Symmetry: C3
Subunit: 151 residues, 3 copies
């Protein structure tokens, strides 16, 4: 039937003085992401991918509240435009800290916010092999892909 | 149904003495994108996503500087030709999504015009075309305003 | 039908004294990619996109660098095992698209061979596999030839 794809990108600076929150999970680290609220780079990328699949513009056009509430509101808008979410996949690029321990928590948060079965939500983690601002630990990036169907 | 997905990436340097053209829209700005044609980074990324989804290779394999048909061609003519070759391969386009990463200028006022241009070029309804924008939070070459990147995703179906 | 999409990213440093192996192809070059495995940036990205489409985590979850077999590992053997697990999870692969970003060497002469390797490893026909190449238009650590990046997208369907 009427499938659509969306894609998302986000990046925030990594500096001392803020908590590190990614996919709704507070992760221990000497530094944190700089941004408007929680600065949750993963949730922002996913939100963008969903708005994009629905052809509803982008996160800034809707939301001029933490990133989970934003994600839930995004999902309601996608629903009203006539779309059902089929799956989400994503990558976090961070040289440090280790994210693997926290992946299931992020997945659970995202699945809850999107009203999706856990097996339709995935989060992957990558380093930048010490290259660039990412590899020097100066920022963290997230990428997201979402598939939806008009129902 | 025989669905396929494609993904595209492009980046160009921002240089003095050239117009800034993104998604077919000329945007007032002191610098423009450097490339063999208008260097429309967004249209190029979408073009690569469509060639990718149809397993037709990539933009540099289709469009040569050398080829008389495409020498003086702008990126919208190339996007139209891409759509032609996708159709020739037996595919129909279902939707396009994309992100422009530019620290500056402000792209918001231009995005609906970009969508309209892409939709016309691809013979798609407006509600199957999407364009998003992001800054790079002052990080790296994008954050320093040295270039602008575009990312695209395309879904097609073999009919 | 129960379609799912996945995406993948990888990057490795380019260093002297290593084979340059991308898409399973040994490319003549004075430098190669640095990793604990054979460091095949394209196959790793594709592997992550396939695990991601199946919601099976990521390549590090599946192939531990603590396994003696990881050192110098043939990333095509890893991709085939990835495909095996994706199948075991109940998914059939519908298509793959990808981009390699490298200042050098020229990848064009090797791309069809990469596509054939990926197609063989995933038991797909050639017409469902695509590999695209880009330079980074001289920007950043990729423009300086310090590393090579790969991006991938995969579509699967749960049978
Ligand atoms: N160069 C840029 C970058 C971003 N934007 C818009 O700002 C909002 C927050 O990213 C988003 O709504 C985005 O569209 C913009 O107008 N120009
Ligand atoms: N390192 C690279 C980068 C790009 N290319 C090929 O050049 C054309 C323009 O990106 C594209 O056709 C691309 O495939 C290449 O052969 N080697
Ligand atoms: N910041 C990061 C980066 C990566 N990873 C995990 O380590 C594996 C190899 O990079 C990756 O495949 C991923 O499993 C992690 O846990 N935290
Ligand atoms: O999942 C186990 C594992 C870790 S490395 C590995 C492997 C390495 C080389 C060839 N075939 C397999 N297998
Ligand atoms: O267990 C691992 C470790 C590193 C890996 N990797 C880093 C960059 N590319 C693959 C993959 C799997
Ligand atoms: Cl490796
Ligand atoms: K990037
Ligand atoms: Zn953000
Ligand atoms: Zn271009
Ligand atoms: Zn790798």
């Amino acid at each position: 039937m009427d499938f659509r794809i969306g894609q998302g990108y986000d990046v925030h600076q990594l500096v001392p003085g803020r908590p590190l929150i990614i996919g709704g999970v507070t992760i221990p680290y000497e530094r944190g992401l700089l941004g408007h609220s929680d600065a949750d780079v993963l949730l922002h990328a996913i939100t963008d991918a969903l708005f994009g699949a629905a052809a509803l513009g982008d996160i800034g056009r809707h939301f001029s509240a933490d990133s989970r509430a934003l994600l839930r509101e995004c999902a309601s808008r996608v629903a009203q435009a006539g779309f059902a979410i089929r799956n989400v996949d994503s990558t976090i690029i961070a040289q440090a800290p280790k994210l693997a321990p926290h992946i299931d928590a992020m997945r659970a948060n995202i699945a809850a916010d999107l009203d999706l079965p856990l097996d339709r939500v995935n989060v992957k983690a990558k380093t930048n092999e010490k290259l660039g601002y990412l590899g020097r630990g100066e920022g963290i990036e997230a990428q997201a892909a979402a598939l939806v169907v008009r129902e």
